[PDB]
Design a protein around this ligand. Structure first.
Ligand SMILES: *[C@H]1O[C@H](CO)[C@@H](O)[C@H](O)[C@@H]1O
Ligand SMILES: *[C@H]1O[C@H](CO)[C@@H](O)[C@H](O)[C@@H]1O
Ligand SMILES: *[C@H]1O[C@H](CO)[C@@H](O)[C@H](O)[C@@H]1O
Ligand SMILES: *[C@H]1O[C@H](CO)[C@@H](O)[C@H](O)[C@@H]1O
Lengths: 113, 96
């Protein structure tokens, strides 16, 4: 009995960050050729890339006459961009009172009599 | 020439999302035992959790009321250190 030659190296178990490959062979005319019908090796050992997605822009808002909006980037070290996602926009407001500044840009006034 | 019993499965290559582990055994009294000295199986196929980090708040801006905004960044990862929020970007133009 005798081993056949190796076939191709087949699919790596990972896209990045290290996985394994296998190749196979057949023991002809017997169940028990010396050694193993399958051989393994390392593949795609490169570290996974930093993938990025930007948030949507916030709405335009006045500066004082200029307007501005904001965004951020979300970054992750991932094999697959579908595994990275931007969540919902969250809005916080605060009441500035009828004078338009107390609790916002100004604190409570103190008057010494 | 005879194999020893299989050794225990080695540490999984991943904590989540599917990794691999190996078990081994030794052919005593010669090299040419029939069969294999290593086997692999899958391990930790539990999906990676969705890790979430909030962005900083934008500055307060007027709407009586002021408002600010944030988002969340989400990734399927084993390790929160691999998720990061980038720098705040401001776009500006004349107006309103
Ligand atoms: C197949 O495996 C090796 C050859 O690559 C030897 O142990 C022997 O030839 C066996 O049939
Ligand atoms: C398969 O492995 C190598 C070729 O890649 C050689 O030792 C031989 O061809 C074997 O069957
Ligand atoms: C070890 O592998 C198998 C038993 O697990 C047989 O091919 C033989 O006993 C060998 O020594
Ligand atoms: C390891 O594999 C199985 C048990 O897991 C048996 O064939 C034998 O115990 C071998 O050493």
């Amino acid at each position: 009995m005798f081993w056949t030659g190796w076939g191709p190296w087949e699919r790596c178990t990972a896209q990045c960050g290290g996985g394994i490959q296998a190749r196979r062979r057949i023991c002809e005319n017997g169940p028990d050729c010396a050694g193993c019908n399958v051989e393994y090796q390392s593949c795609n050992t490169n570290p996974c890339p930093e993938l990025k997605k930007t948030t949507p822009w916030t709405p335009w808002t006045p500066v004082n006459h200029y307007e501005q909006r904001f965004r951020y980037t979300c970054k992750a070290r991932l094999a697959d961009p579908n595994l990275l996602e931007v969540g919902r926009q969250r809005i916080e407001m605060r009441y500035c009172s009828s004078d338009g500044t107390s609790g916002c840009s100004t604190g409570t006034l103190e008057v010494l009599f």
